[PDB]
Amino acid sequence: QGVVGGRTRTGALANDTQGTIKGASLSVPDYYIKHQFDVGKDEIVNSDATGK
Amino acid sequence: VKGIPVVSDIDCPANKMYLLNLDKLAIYSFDQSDADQSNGKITYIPLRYVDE
């Protein structure tokens, strides 16, 4: 925050501080929540024709 | 032999002769084509045979 100092009516005009604005930076990670699977292509038709 | 054809082949066990009932001997292939992709990797040429 920019601190406020104050002065008299006709006193000096010294400065007072400002507030820092930081550039916050994240990134979608280079990583995944992945889940992969290999079905036997045989199983796909077989189970399609056989699953109860 | 009593109307049963006696077709022969080279790759038949030597001192044997099989009497087969072709309406009760079958070849079953697993048609896993339905689970193929539609790219073109798989082609499925039907197999060729010769009796002579």
PDB file of C-alpha atoms in Angstrom, chain B:
ATOM      1  CA  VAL B   1     -15.065 -95.899 -51.554  1.00  0.00           C
ATOM      2  CA  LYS B   2     -18.833 -96.339 -51.292  1.00  0.00           C
ATOM      3  CA  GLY B   3     -19.235 -92.887 -52.790  1.00  0.00           C
ATOM      4  CA  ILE B   4     -16.819 -91.306 -50.314  1.00  0.00           C
ATOM      5  CA  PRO B   5     -14.197 -89.362 -52.301  1.00  0.00           C
ATOM      6  CA  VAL B   6     -10.635 -90.252 -51.387  1.00  0.00           C
ATOM      7  CA  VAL B   7      -8.924 -86.971 -52.256  1.00  0.00           C
ATOM      8  CA  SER B   8      -5.303 -87.073 -51.136  1.00  0.00           C
ATOM      9  CA  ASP B   9      -2.589 -84.603 -50.247  1.00  0.00           C
ATOM     10  CA  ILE B  10       1.120 -84.588 -49.611  1.00  0.00           C
ATOM     11  CA  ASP B  11       0.965 -83.110 -46.111  1.00  0.00           C
ATOM     12  CA  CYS B  12      -1.228 -85.840 -44.631  1.00  0.00           C
ATOM     13  CA  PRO B  13       0.167 -88.236 -42.012  1.00  0.00           C
ATOM     14  CA  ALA B  14       1.824 -91.012 -43.942  1.00  0.00           C
ATOM     15  CA  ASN B  15       0.268 -94.293 -42.864  1.00  0.00           C
ATOM     16  CA  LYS B  16      -3.179 -92.862 -42.173  1.00  0.00           C
ATOM     17  CA  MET B  17      -6.379 -92.134 -44.020  1.00  0.00           C
ATOM     18  CA  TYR B  18      -8.996 -89.919 -42.402  1.00  0.00           C
ATOM     19  CA  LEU B  19     -12.670 -90.264 -43.190  1.00  0.00           C
ATOM     20  CA  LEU B  20     -14.147 -86.815 -42.654  1.00  0.00           C
ATOM     21  CA  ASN B  21     -17.707 -85.535 -42.509  1.00  0.00           C
ATOM     22  CA  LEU B  22     -17.385 -82.073 -44.014  1.00  0.00           C
ATOM     23  CA  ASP B  23     -20.836 -81.026 -42.887  1.00  0.00           C
ATOM     24  CA  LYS B  24     -19.535 -81.708 -39.375  1.00  0.00           C
ATOM     25  CA  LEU B  25     -15.968 -80.428 -39.746  1.00  0.00           C
ATOM     26  CA  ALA B  26     -15.804 -76.656 -39.771  1.00  0.00           C
ATOM     27  CA  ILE B  27     -13.249 -73.861 -39.825  1.00  0.00           C
ATOM     28  CA  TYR B  28     -14.005 -70.992 -37.471  1.00  0.00           C
ATOM     29  CA  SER B  29     -12.195 -67.682 -37.778  1.00  0.00           C
ATOM     30  CA  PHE B  30     -12.570 -64.837 -35.301  1.00  0.00           C
ATOM     31  CA  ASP B  31     -13.954 -61.815 -37.153  1.00  0.00           C
ATOM     32  CA  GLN B  32     -12.255 -59.021 -35.223  1.00  0.00           C
ATOM     33  CA  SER B  33     -12.626 -56.647 -38.169  1.00  0.00           C
ATOM     34  CA  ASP B  34     -15.441 -54.706 -36.515  1.00  0.00           C
ATOM     35  CA  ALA B  35     -12.988 -53.389 -33.921  1.00  0.00           C
ATOM     36  CA  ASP B  36     -10.534 -52.221 -36.569  1.00  0.00           C
ATOM     37  CA  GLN B  37      -9.980 -48.549 -37.185  1.00  0.00           C
ATOM     38  CA  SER B  38     -11.084 -46.925 -40.448  1.00  0.00           C
ATOM     39  CA  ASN B  39      -7.613 -45.717 -41.447  1.00  0.00           C
ATOM     40  CA  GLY B  40      -6.420 -48.402 -43.855  1.00  0.00           C
ATOM     41  CA  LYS B  41      -3.754 -50.305 -41.950  1.00  0.00           C
ATOM     42  CA  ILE B  42      -5.851 -53.488 -42.069  1.00  0.00           C
ATOM     43  CA  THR B  43      -6.904 -54.990 -45.373  1.00  0.00           C
ATOM     44  CA  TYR B  44      -8.265 -58.557 -44.939  1.00  0.00           C
ATOM     45  CA  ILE B  45      -7.489 -60.392 -48.165  1.00  0.00           C
ATOM     46  CA  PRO B  46      -9.339 -63.740 -48.290  1.00  0.00           C
ATOM     47  CA  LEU B  47      -6.977 -66.685 -48.324  1.00  0.00           C
ATOM     48  CA  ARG B  48      -6.434 -68.585 -51.574  1.00  0.00           C
ATOM     49  CA  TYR B  49      -6.323 -72.370 -51.836  1.00  0.00           C
ATOM     50  CA  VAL B  50      -5.717 -74.935 -54.573  1.00  0.00           C
ATOM     51  CA  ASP B  51      -6.846 -78.544 -54.658  1.00  0.00           C
ATOM     52  CA  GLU B  52      -4.496 -79.551 -57.493  1.00  0.00           C
TER      53      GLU B  52
END
